[PDB]
């Protein structure tokens, strides 16, 4: 919670002063971070998915969820019930630890960096993004992983709109344009 | 009509039995069930037979 | 030819009538075990002193007078019995 404490001492009041919120809990707070990574090639090789699951358990210290097909789609040759994806949800101290790790170490390590887009808020303030490459996390040992495998990071926030969503992210010195 | 009639014989040795069906191409292992034995009036293990 | 031979239909099949419906109506005095309605699904639900069988046959669980009523948030049709 080394950034949870950082949140509650300045950021709450910072949004309070500049948005005229009536109560302090009206200042939004990030509730969970969902770590999604859909392999899409388990049909070709089941065995690449367990290795992929191990990769995501290294980057974030949690066992990932193996998602099911949930519906048969012939355009991709999938039948329902087949393992197709990997998922983790992080809340509380583990969530904050992953958040600070991402922003401080990993986000600078992005190749061909230009920062992050500020328009991917789905209209309701919840951020979602995709990293192009996976070696950027120091948890995984370079040269011991089979292939590069990106993933999607979505920040689900209590914020009801993107404007106050941007205030929360910016008060964390999130990389906006 | 792939499923075939099989006989479940009590392990109590009283000669009573039940009849049912089993698919033998899959699940080829024996079927075991605690079922009521009308002769000794108790629940005993019934084993696959026939 | 002098006559033109016809074809053949392909729709000749039908199944036997199952004699479904309400056996005893409102106001009937029934014994225990009497069948009130024979159903496919639960068009009528079981109320007080009325039981529902495996094929959703509603039967009397007591002697008395049959009564139909509408209850519940969904306006479903229940069958109950006033013990008499």
């Amino acid at each position: 919670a080394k950034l949870h404490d950082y949140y509650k001492d300045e950021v709450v009041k910072k949004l309070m002063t500049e948005f005229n919120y009536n109560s302090v809990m009206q200042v939004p707070r990030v509730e969970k971070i969902t770590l999604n990574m859909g392999v899409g090639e388990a049909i070709a090789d089941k065995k690449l998915l367990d290795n992929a699951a191990a990769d995501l358990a290294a980057i974030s210290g949690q066992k990932p969820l193996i998602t099911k097909a949930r519906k048969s789609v012939a355009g991709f040759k999938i039948r329902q019930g087949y393992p197709i994806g990997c998922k983790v949800t992080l809340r509380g101290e583990r969530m904050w630890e992953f958040f600070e790790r991402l922003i401080t170490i990993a986000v600078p390590r992005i190749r061909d960096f230009r920062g992050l887009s500020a328009k991917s808020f789905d209209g309701r303030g919840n951020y979602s993004m995709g990293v192009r490459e996976q070696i950027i996390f120091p948890e995984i040992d370079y040269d011991k992983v089979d292939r590069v495998r990106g993933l999607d990071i979505t920040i689900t926030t209590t914020a009801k709109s993107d404007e106050e969503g941007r205030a929360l992210l910016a008060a964390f010195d999130f990389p906006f344009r | 009509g792939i499923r075939e009639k099989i006989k479940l014989v009590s392990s109590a040795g009283t000669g009573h039995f039940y009849t049912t069906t089993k698919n033998k191409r899959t699940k080829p292992e024996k079927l075991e069930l605690k079922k009521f034995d009308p002769v000794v009036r108790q629940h005993v293990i019934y084993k696959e037979a026939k | 030819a002098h006559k033109k031979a016809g074809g053949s239909t392909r729709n000749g099949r039908d199944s036997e009538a199952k004699r479904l419906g309400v056996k005893r109506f409102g106001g009937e005095s029934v014994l225990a075990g009497s069948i009130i309605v024979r159903q496919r699904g639960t068009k009528f639900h079981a109320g007080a002193n009325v039981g529902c069988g495996r094929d959703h046959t509603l039967f009397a669980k007591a002697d008395g007078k049959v009564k139909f009523e509408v209850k519940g948030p969904k306006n479903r049709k229940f069958i109950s019995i006033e013990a008499e």
Binding site: - | - | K3, K4, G6
Partner: protein, 136 residues
């Protein structure tokens, strides 16, 4: 040739043409052709009337078809005996009750619309009449 693009079933019972009509008012245009009698309008009959009626007004105004052939009619072939299943669908018809408005017209003078409906009604088996729109 008016005809449903697809149907739930390809054959239908004969039925009965009873009762009065629904849609007895001029709801779209300003003038209308209203059926006085009852009977069946084939798609060919409806379409032949439409050709004469649209050609009468020199392709002016707007023309509305208010009826649709949705009832299929089967006919047994020549020299086949009774039975051996129902016949094959030959054509489609609409059932017409007294008072139903069959065609509507707008954008043209009343004296021209009256003449156009005369030529159009010459193609229909059922008695018709000329009606205009009214405020209810």
């Amino acid at each position: 040739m008016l005809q449903p693009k697809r149907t739930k079933f390809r054959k239908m019972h004969k039925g009965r043409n009873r009762g009065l009509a629904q849609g007895t008012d001029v709801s779209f245009g300003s003038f209308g052709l209203k059926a006085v009698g009852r009977g069946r309008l084939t798609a060919r009959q409806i379409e032949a009337a439409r050709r004469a009626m649209t050609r009468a007004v020199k392709r002016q105004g707007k023309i509305w078809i208010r009826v649709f052939p949705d009832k299929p009619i089967t006919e047994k072939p020549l020299a086949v005996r009774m039975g051996k299943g129902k016949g094959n669908v030959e054509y489609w018809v609409a059932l017409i009750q007294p008072g139903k408005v069959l065609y509507e017209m707008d954008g043209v003078p009343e004296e021209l619309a009256r003449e156009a409906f005369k030529l159009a009604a010459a193609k229909l088996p059922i008695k018709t009449t000329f009606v205009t729109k009214t405020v209810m």
